Amino acid sequence: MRECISIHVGQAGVQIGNACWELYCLEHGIQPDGQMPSDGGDDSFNTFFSETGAGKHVPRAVFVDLEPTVIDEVRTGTYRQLFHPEQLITGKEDAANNYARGHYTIGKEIIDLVLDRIRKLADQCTGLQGFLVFHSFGGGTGSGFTSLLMERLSVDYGKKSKLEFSIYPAPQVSTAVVEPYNSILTTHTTLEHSDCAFMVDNEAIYDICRRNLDIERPTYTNLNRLISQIVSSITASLRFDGALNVDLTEFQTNLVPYPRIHFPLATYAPVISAEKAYHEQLSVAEITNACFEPANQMVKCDPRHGKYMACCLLYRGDVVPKDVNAAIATIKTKRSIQFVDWCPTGFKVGINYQPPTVVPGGDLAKVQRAVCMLSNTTAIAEAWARLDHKFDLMYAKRAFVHWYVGEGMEEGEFSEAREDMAALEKDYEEVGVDSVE
Amino acid sequence: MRECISIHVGQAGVQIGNACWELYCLEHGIQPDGQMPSDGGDDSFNTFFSETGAGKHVPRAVFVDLEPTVIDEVRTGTYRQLFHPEQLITGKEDAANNYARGHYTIGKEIIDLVLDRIRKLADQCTGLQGFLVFHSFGGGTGSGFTSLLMERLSVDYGKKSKLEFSIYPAPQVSTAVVEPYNSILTTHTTLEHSDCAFMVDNEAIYDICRRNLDIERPTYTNLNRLISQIVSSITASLRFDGALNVDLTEFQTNLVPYPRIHFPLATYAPVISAEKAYHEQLSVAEITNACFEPANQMVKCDPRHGKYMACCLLYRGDVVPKDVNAAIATIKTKRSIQFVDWCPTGFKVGINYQPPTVVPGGDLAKVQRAVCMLSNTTAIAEAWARLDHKFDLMYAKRAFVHWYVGEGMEEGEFSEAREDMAALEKDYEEVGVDSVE
Amino acid sequence: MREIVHIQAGQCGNQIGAKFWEVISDEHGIDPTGSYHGDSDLQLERINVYYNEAAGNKYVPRAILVDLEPGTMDSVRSGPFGQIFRPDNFVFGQSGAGNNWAKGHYTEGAELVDSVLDVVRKESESCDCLQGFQLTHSLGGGTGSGMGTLLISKIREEYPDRIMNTFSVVPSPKVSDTVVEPYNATLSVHQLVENTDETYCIDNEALYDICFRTLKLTTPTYGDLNHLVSATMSGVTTCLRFPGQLNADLRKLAVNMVPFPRLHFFMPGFAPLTSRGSQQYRALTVPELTQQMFDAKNMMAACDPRHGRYLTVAAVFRGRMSMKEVDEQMLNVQNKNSSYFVEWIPNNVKTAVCDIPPRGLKMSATFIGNSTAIQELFKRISEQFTAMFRRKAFLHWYTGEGMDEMEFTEAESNMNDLVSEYQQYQDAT
Amino acid sequence: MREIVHIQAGQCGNQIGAKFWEVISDEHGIDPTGSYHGDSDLQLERINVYYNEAAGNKYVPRAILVDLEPGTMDSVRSGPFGQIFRPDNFVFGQSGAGNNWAKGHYTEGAELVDSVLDVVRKESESCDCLQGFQLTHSLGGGTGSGMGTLLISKIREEYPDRIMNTFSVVPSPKVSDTVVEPYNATLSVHQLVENTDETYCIDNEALYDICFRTLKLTTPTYGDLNHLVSATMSGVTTCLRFPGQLNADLRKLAVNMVPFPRLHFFMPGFAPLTSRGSQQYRALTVPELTQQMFDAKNMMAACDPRHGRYLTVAAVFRGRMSMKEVDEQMLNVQNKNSSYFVEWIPNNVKTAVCDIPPRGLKMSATFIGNSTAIQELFKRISEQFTAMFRRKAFLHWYTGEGMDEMEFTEAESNMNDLVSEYQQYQDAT
Ligand SMILES: Nc1nc2c(ncn2[C@@H]2O[C@H](COP(=O)(O)OP(=O)(O)OP(=O)(O)O)[C@@H](O)[C@H]2O)c(=O)[nH]1
Ligand SMILES: Nc1nc2c(ncn2[C@@H]2O[C@H](COP(=O)(O)OP(=O)(O)OP(=O)(O)O)[C@@H](O)[C@H]2O)c(=O)[nH]1
Ligand SMILES: Nc1nc2c(ncn2[C@@H]2O[C@H](COP(=O)(O)OP(=O)(O)O)[C@@H](O)[C@H]2O)c(=O)[nH]1
Ligand SMILES: Nc1nc2c(ncn2[C@@H]2O[C@H](COP(=O)(O)OP(=O)(O)O)[C@@H](O)[C@H]2O)c(=O)[nH]1
Ligand SMILES: [Mg+2]
Ligand SMILES: [Mg+2]
Numbered sequence A, B: 001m002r003e004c005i006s007i008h009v010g011q012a013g014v015q016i017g018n019a020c021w022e023l024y025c026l027e028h029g030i031q032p033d034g035q036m037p038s039d040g041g042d043d044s045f046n047t048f049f050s051e052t053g054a055g056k057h058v059p060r061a062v063f064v065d066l067e068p069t070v071i072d073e074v075r076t077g078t079y080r081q082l083f084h085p086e087q088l089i090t091g092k093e094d095a096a097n098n099y100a101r102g103h104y105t106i107g108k109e110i111i112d113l114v115l116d117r118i119r120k121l122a123d124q125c126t127g128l129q130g131f132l133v134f135h136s137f138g139g140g141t142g143s144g145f146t147s148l149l150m151e152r153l154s155v156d157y158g159k160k161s162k163l164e165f166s167i168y169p170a171p172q173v174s175t176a177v178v179e180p181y182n183s184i185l186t187t188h189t190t191l192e193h194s195d196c197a198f199m200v201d202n203e204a205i206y207d208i209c210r211r212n213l214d215i216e217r218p219t220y221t222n223l224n225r226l227i228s229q230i231v232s233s234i235t236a237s238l239r240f241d242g243a244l245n246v247d248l249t250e251f252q253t254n255l256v257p258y259p260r261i262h263f264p265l266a267t268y269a270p271v272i273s274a275e276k277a278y279h280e281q282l283s284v285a286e287i288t289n290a291c292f293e294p295a296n297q298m299v300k301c302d303p304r305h306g307k308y309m310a311c312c313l314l315y316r317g318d319v320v321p322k323d324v325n326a327a328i329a330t331i332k333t334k335r336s337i338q339f340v341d342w343c344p345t346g347f348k349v350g351i352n353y354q355p356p357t358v359v360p361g362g363d364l365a366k367v368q369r370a371v372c373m374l375s376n377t378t379a380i381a382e383a384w385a386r387l388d389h390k391f392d393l394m395y396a397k398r399a400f401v402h403w404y405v406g407e408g409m410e411e412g413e414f415s416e417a418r419e420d421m422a423a424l425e426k427d428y429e430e431v432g433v434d435s436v437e
Numbered sequence C, D: 001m002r003e004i005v006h007i008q009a010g011q012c013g014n015q016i017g018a019k020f021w022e023v024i025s026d027e028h029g030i031d032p033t034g035s036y037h038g039d040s041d042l043q044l045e046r047i048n049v050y051y052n053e054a055a056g057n058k059y060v061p062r063a064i065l066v067d068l069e070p071g072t073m074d075s076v077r078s079g080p081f082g083q084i085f086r087p088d089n090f091v092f093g094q095s096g097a098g099n100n101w102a103k104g105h106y107t108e109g110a111e112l113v114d115s116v117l118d119v120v121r122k123e124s125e126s127c128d129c130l131q132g133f134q135l136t137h138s139l140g141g142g143t144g145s146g147m148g149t150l151l152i153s154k155i156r157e158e159y160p161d162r163i164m165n166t167f168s169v170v171p172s173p174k175v176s177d178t179v180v181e182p183y184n185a186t187l188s189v190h191q192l193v194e195n196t197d198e199t200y201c202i203d204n205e206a207l208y209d210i211c212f213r214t215l216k217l218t219t220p221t222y223g224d225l226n227h228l229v230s231a232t233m234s235g236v237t238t239c240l241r242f243p244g245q246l247n248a249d250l251r252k253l254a255v256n257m258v259p260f261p262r263l264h265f266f267m268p269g270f271a272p273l274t275s276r277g278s279q280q281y282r283a284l285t286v287p288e289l290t291q292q293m294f295d296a297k298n299m300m301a302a303c304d305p306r307h308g309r310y311l312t313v314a315a316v317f318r319g320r321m322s323m324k325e326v327d328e329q330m331l332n333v334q335n336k337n338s339s340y341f342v343e344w345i346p347n348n349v350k351t352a353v354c355d356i357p358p359r360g361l362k363m364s365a366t367f368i369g370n371s372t373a374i375q376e377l378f379k380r381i382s383e384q385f386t387a388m389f390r391r392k393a394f395l396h397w398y399t400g401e402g403m404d405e406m407e408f409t410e411a412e413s414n415m416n417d418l419v420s421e422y423q424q425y426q427d428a429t
Helices: A010-027 A069-076 A099-105 A107-123 A140-156 A179-190 A203-211 A220-234 A248-255 A286-292 A321-333 A378-396 A413-432 B010-027 B069-076 B099-105 B107-123 B140-156 B179-190 B203-211 B220-234 B248-255 B286-292 B321-333 B378-396 B413-432 C010-027 C070-078 C101-107 C114-126 C143-158 C181-192 C204-214 C222-236 C286-293 C323-335 C372-389 C405-424 D010-027 D070-078 D101-107 D114-126 D143-158 D181-192 D204-214 D222-236 D286-293 D323-335 D372-389 D405-424
Strands: A005-009 A049-051 A057-059 A061-065 A130-136 A161-168 A196-201 A265-269 A308-317 A347-352 A369-377 B005-009 B049-051 B057-059 B061-065 B130-136 B161-168 B196-201 B265-269 B308-317 B347-352 B369-377 C003-008 C051-054 C058-061 C063-067 C130-138 C163-170 C198-200 C265-271 C310-318 C349-353 C364-371 D003-008 D051-054 D058-061 D063-067 D130-138 D163-170 D198-200 D265-271 D310-318 D349-353 D364-371
Touching: A005 A010, A005 A107, A005 A140, A010 A061, A010 A069, A010 A130, A010 A140, A010 A161, A010 A220, A061 A069, A061 A107, A061 A140, A099 A107, A099 A140, A099 A179, A107 A140, A130 A140, A140 A161, A140 A179, A161 A220, A161 A248, A179 A378, A179 A413, A196 A203, A196 A220, A196 A248, A196 A265, A203 A220, A220 A265, A220 A308, A220 A369, A248 A308, A248 A347, A248 A369, A265 A286, A286 A308, A286 A321, A286 A369, A308 A321, A321 A347, A321 D204, A321 D222, A369 A378, A378 A413, B005 B010, B005 B107, B005 B140, B010 B061, B010 B069, B010 B130, B010 B140, B010 B161, B010 B220, B061 B069, B061 B107, B061 B140, B099 B107, B099 B140, B099 B179, B107 B140, B130 B140, B140 B161, B140 B179, B161 B220, B161 B248, B179 B378, B179 B413, B196 B203, B196 B220, B196 B248, B196 B265, B203 B220, B220 B265, B220 B308, B220 B369, B248 B308, B248 B347, B248 B369, B265 B286, B286 B308, B286 B321, B286 B369, B308 B321, B321 B347, B321 C204, B321 C222, B369 B378, B378 B413, C003 C010, C003 C114, C010 C058, C010 C063, C010 C070, C010 C130, C010 C143, C010 C163, C010 C222, C063 C070, C063 C114, C063 C143, C101 C143, C101 C181, C114 C143, C130 C143, C143 C163, C143 C181, C163 C181, C163 C222, C181 C372, C181 C405, C204 C222, C222 C265, C222 C310, C222 C364, C265 C286, C265 C372, C286 C310, C286 C323, C286 C364, C310 C323, C323 C349, C364 C372, C372 C405, D003 D010, D003 D114, D010 D058, D010 D063, D010 D070, D010 D130, D010 D143, D010 D163, D010 D222, D063 D070, D063 D114, D063 D143, D101 D143, D101 D181, D114 D143, D130 D143, D143 D163, D143 D181, D163 D181, D163 D222, D181 D372, D181 D405, D204 D222, D222 D265, D222 D310, D222 D364, D265 D286, D265 D372, D286 D310, D286 D323, D286 D364, D310 D323, D323 D349, D364 D372, D372 D405
Parallel strands: A005 A061, A005 A130, A130 A161, A161 A196, A308 A347, B005 B061, B005 B130, B130 B161, B161 B196, B308 B347, C003 C063, C003 C130, C130 C163, C163 C198, C198 C265, C310 C349, D003 D063, D003 D130, D130 D163, D163 D198, D198 D265, D310 D349
Antiparallel strands: A049 A057, A265 A369, A308 A369, B049 B057, B265 B369, B308 B369, C051 C058, C265 C364, C310 C364, D051 D058, D265 D364, D310 D364
16 A cells, blocks of 8 residues: 556666566566465555556556657567556657657657557555666666656655666666767756666676676676666565565665755665575675675675765565674774765664575575665765766767757756766765765 | 326437337337237337337327438337327428528428427326427437427426436537537527427447447447437436436436536436456446546546536436445545535435346347436537637628528527527536635 | 334435335334234334325335335335335426435425425324324435425424424535535525424444444445444334333424523434444343443444533433433443533433334444534534535536625635634534 | 454564564464364363354454554454454454554554544454553553553543553663653653553563573574563463463452552563573573562562562463462562562562463463662653653654653653652552
8 A cells, every 4th residue: 555656768767677567566476467276465566556446457657758669578478468658658760879858859849649648557556655767877867767756756746755777877888879868968957856866887786697697698687676676675665574674765864964965876786696596605794794885786886985874784585683683793894885974873774574486597696685785875986086087078079969959958058067976976076075074 | 196298309319219229128028010919018118109009108298300211110010000190290401501491491391380389288287297309410400390390398387307318519529520610500499499309429429338338330220329328317206216316307406507508418328338248346436436436437538527507317226225324425525526615515316126138139238227427517518609600700701691591591590599698608607606705 | 102204315315215124124013015914013003103004904115205216216115115105196307306405405306395294294194192203314415405404494394393304414424425415405504494493414424434343344335334223213213113211202302402492413422332242242231222222333424412402312222121221321431421411401311211122132222413523524524525615616506506705705604603602502502 | 252352562472472473373273364273172162262263163363553654554354363463353443553653643643543443443342351451562652652541541431440560661670772762751650650551561672682691592582582572462361262270360450460550560570491402401490480470580670679669460371280389489489588578568469370381381470560770761761751841853754743841841750750659668668
């Protein structure tokens, strides 16, 4: 009865949801037809699966893209029978790595179609908590249409807990050229709207899928499994009764000290292969040190170059709360994990009774416990300092600006987004320092 | 015992009744031979099917046209064995998009034949309530002969509840050129005679059959199915016992505040295809918001450009009256649905225990509940303002007037019909304003 | 003796009454046929008030079912407990009121009412000593507002001393079920204040809450709402039909509850009202039944009593219980709510206890509340009336049926001569 | 008589309470259904304090379970002993506090609290003579800190004389479970010092030790920690529910343990606490139970009592034992620790003996300690508060929910008007 609908913008957001809704069907015994064999659940599915008249459950997902091809693979894939076909929204031409086409030219066409499909879902939700917007900072749809959409949901709702799961652009891996433009522009808009936007990077999952999973060749099939285990473990406390539950309203409360700073970086553990499911015992003390280890985070940032402002350990499965305190009290004593001077209480702890399940065809191993760390840290200021530096090199020559001015955007609006991003950059410098006396 | 005969004028009215009487035979188990297998009805058919001496039921329908071809397809179609062949009335030459030929030249020939066939049916009716005239505003027969017929039935009966189901001319779709002439002339006459004329537009069903049913190519076979579901759901309370029944005398009472304003626009829901019969649950709260949504009405008018004077939600099937109040009390709180200042009680609610059945070969889906909204609104003044504007452009050049003067009509009679229509146009302005103090 | 002739008008009054005679036939052990099949003679002791004994030890309900269309009656006469009524009593027209008061009171009502009163006068002379006539109808419909209030004006002229209690389903505050229900109500309240000894205002919005909130019914049909109205209706006359430790009747509830003859518009209430699971998690005591009545969320008329003062209060109880356990609780809710009760009526609680509980119940209540909370019931309708009437909307569906605007000028002023009287006796020191 | 209404706020207070009503239903022999299935009438003698007797000889717990999300309640209502509560009592919202005090006390708390107090007032009037309300919540959460301290401010206005004992799970010194738990604590201690007659500070860090050190639990889940909190909770009111040789209640523990009305922040303690094997290698004597309480490693509030002075001390004992064997040991720990007890309260030990032991125990204790050792409990939190607040971190998740910085300027000063008072009455001659 604590319903939570999810929006999937861009090619990245749909392909993430193709693994997320694959994972949710396995956690509730749902077939791809929706007909779950009810031959123990007890309204566990309710936060994502509005039930139809038959024995068929359909998801609370709005898959939106401006180009049809990534939606049409869902429409012809295994989960054809699952999704409501009015939710699968297509445009005609993509925004095509153009923020202004996602926000002014093409995005204005179907934005009233998307807000209609949200409002049909939001009316049949009786205890609606918040939103799960899946998008990327690189593409024109995931930047332009999301920023157009987050303008509209804060107008229509405002008080709902609007959460994002963004694909942050990597420092040296960039599959697009104007990622320094689409990321600065979409963050200038989503700053005053999104309650807590979870950063995820591709390169830091290229590190994890090569090292921790021992996969030589990780695919975007595999990177979306690890993001699905994050979003499942955040919504594991809603869907399943835990020893210490945590709502989506609790995440924005415990992790966001200032309304500007709402950019935590997720971290999942244990990420081990099937051969290494043995050879280690995986205590809650063992899987907690994996999260604060800087090599195992999922945004390419060095947390030793900054300070954690608020960490959020979301345990699930066979977890004992006394050994939790044994795992956490040691980490505040370690010097490499340091907090900010004003935060003595740098933790929010959640425990679920359900283990993470493994998707068949997956690369993770069957483990009896997991942890989804959601740590808001000062180390992301190193990430924004790169991205303004990638912005300032391109914009000083006025490169690629005519692809954005010719789609309705002011040239001076880039001066607005960059100076606002510079104002966000000094905020981590303002918060990262200690207090006088 | 609450009998209700129906008249079918013009090519449109016969083709509508070919789907309506197709639908009524399936709701009562009637074969096209009339021999229903009586191997639960209990005088349900009585309001339309006067029984013969054998086990054969014949309809209370008077199919009239001035040209034989649309009648002859009924005479050679599947329902040859059903209809009484004296009811199937043909002329020789059609009125042929000439109101004056339907009202003076050709219509005067068989008008005494039609009034004879009505009076033979009206004598074997023991509890006769009213009439169901099916016609169009465009054609010469559906405009001319109906207006001649409605003159005669108000003379002979007067107190009966004469209802019309008119095909209103679309704003940009016109299959005839002199539709701005035939529609103004037929409304000047049917105003003082018809008790409550239900407007239906083709273009707004072209919208619904393309969008809501996902049919790329809707035929006049398909548009007449949706009008048949309207007229079945209005007469569902007569034919079937409901949790809250509604007679045809109740519609003219609840919906007509002033004797001029008697033009509601019908709206049916749910209109969903067979693939989308799943993927949604269709509560009585879900199917009620579909009716007041401006995209799902069946006259091309914007109800947000006006005010509802009286709405009439005719539920049927698995409908619970408490959730009805849950569905309706929310809509009076919504700002997009606004009523007029003098009408606090803007609803008439009816519930039937019978679901709508689906015709085999139909495009609608099997649903357990439905709603036929009959909403008299101020937004139809936008429709008459177009149609006078289409009238005033043609008549100022005196275009097409010689086809009407040469058939017995005065040229000054167009000044009578236009100034009367202008007097109807200010009535929605007079009613649409609020009250002083 | 003290027989009661039940009259049903409109679609609504038939659907209430067909459920009402389902309750009476279960309280008296009557089969679907019409024969007695109970256990004790206490069901047969006062069987005669709602029943005439036919030949062959069968009982016909003393009921007169009136409509203007055959659609409601054929659902009644063919459903369960439809073969128990006499086929003479089903006096229905053919034309239908058309959800119109003027067609129900002038045009199609007057062309049937002489064939109704001759069934009334047939049943009234079959009564030994007539107690009075109970009527079940609505105020939003056309028949039940028109034909019903035409029957009361004929009966009070022909039976001036008999009690005339009507069970009027007053329209709902949030939703409407009729566009012209402010017209059908105000033209009926013109006829209810002068010819009824009492009138029980029931709202469909309030029963939508009580099914959802109190009984936890996710899908309440009309068959579930009408079992709550009929639980009041059998609970009002349960001391007239059964022995009790303190018997009341329809004249005790007339005298004690009507301090001024216009101010006879009551709100009912029923207790206990439990869910399926939540009835074994609750002790059925008289202090539990008492506090369940007097709150806001158990009033079948959709108005909070906290907005007004209770003028008079009746609490008809059923089942075996002790009188001190009653009389303390009738005092206990008057001490803590001394501002909520009216001051110049000291000890304004009528008590009645019947010895026979309802079927499947250990004990039960039936609240009757006469409050100034239903001045807002007529503040709402007369505001909805005047907003429609100042534009003269829907006037020609009434003026064309034999009516002038002077009918509306009186009926609106008659209601505002009643709104000002509840305001007078709420402000009274 | 002397009935106690149990209120549960937050996820934590529900998980304590669902284990707490597992202990009470075993001490009174109550089945999972709700019926009595014990052996003696002493369980039924004072059954009425935590139970209302429903119909059919079933007992519902006098418990009001409050949350802001349905995730905790559906674990409660579907688990063991979940079919025993009334479905009316589960008053939960939908939005969730979001681990926020301001959303628990201003935004989502106020939009539910009127539907909670009407269940309080329903249970309070079902009490014969109300003793007072016990509450189970946390100070690190959002609901239990917000909705709980909103319930106390409503109740103390409506019930000023009744005792208001809260079982507050104070946050841990080493680890946190919440980033903003210095904010949720300080805004709740602002509301606890003015509206609670007593408050039992419990730390999860201290129960992590007692499970590992004292009971030798390598894997203690919350179901093992909550059986230690509920052992205190049933042990506080065990002389109110059972006869004893020296009966205490929640007012004797209020008067004897609160020398100054702000200084009502207690630390509990339980004895015996044994392992599985190590319980047959130990003589269960009153001198064994006494010295097990008064050491540092059996305080459920994570602070050493050696850093302060015991102001007042209560030792509620269970099971049959002799009073001299008690009263020597209550003197014996006061002679050797004369500096550890406060000087200007001579003979500062309250004694209570119940005759009924816990199930499966020969004898048992329940320590209540009011010390100046919990000035370091607030020296730690107000230092963790001021370090976060001087940078105004996480302020906009509170300022955006209807709060100013003046709320924090008072709540921090109110806690330092309490730290200075324990320092005043530890330095007192
Ligand atoms: N983690 C992850 N990222 C993906 C995946 N697929 C695409 N991306 C990211 O998406 C970014 C580009 O944005 P897209 O989603 O492809 O494009 P868009 O948002 O639809 O906008 P358009 O360019 O107009 O199509 C790239 O930088 C990729 O990092 C995926 O399967 N997993
Ligand atoms: N909804 C609907 N409208 C129809 C259908 N067939 C014809 N029409 C309408 O009928 C209008 C023209 O009137 P007709 O009925 O064809 O002609 P008529 O009324 O017989 O008069 P004549 O021109 O003399 O034949 C067109 O504008 C169409 O919109 C149909 O099957 N369904
Ligand atoms: N309580 C209740 N009210 C009903 C029921 N059926 C209809 N109504 C009410 O009756 C009113 C319509 O009156 P109705 O008798 O159907 O129309 P009439 O026959 O012309 O008088 C509506 O306002 C409904 O709220 C029912 O089963 N129970
Ligand atoms: N002793 C104990 N403490 C708990 C338990 N579950 C949660 N907590 C504590 O409760 C705090 C979280 O409060 P919670 O009620 O879950 O959040 P809320 O619902 O927003 O108030 C954490 O600091 C935990 O230490 C439990 O089972 N036992
Ligand atoms: Mg893309
Ligand atoms: Mg034609």
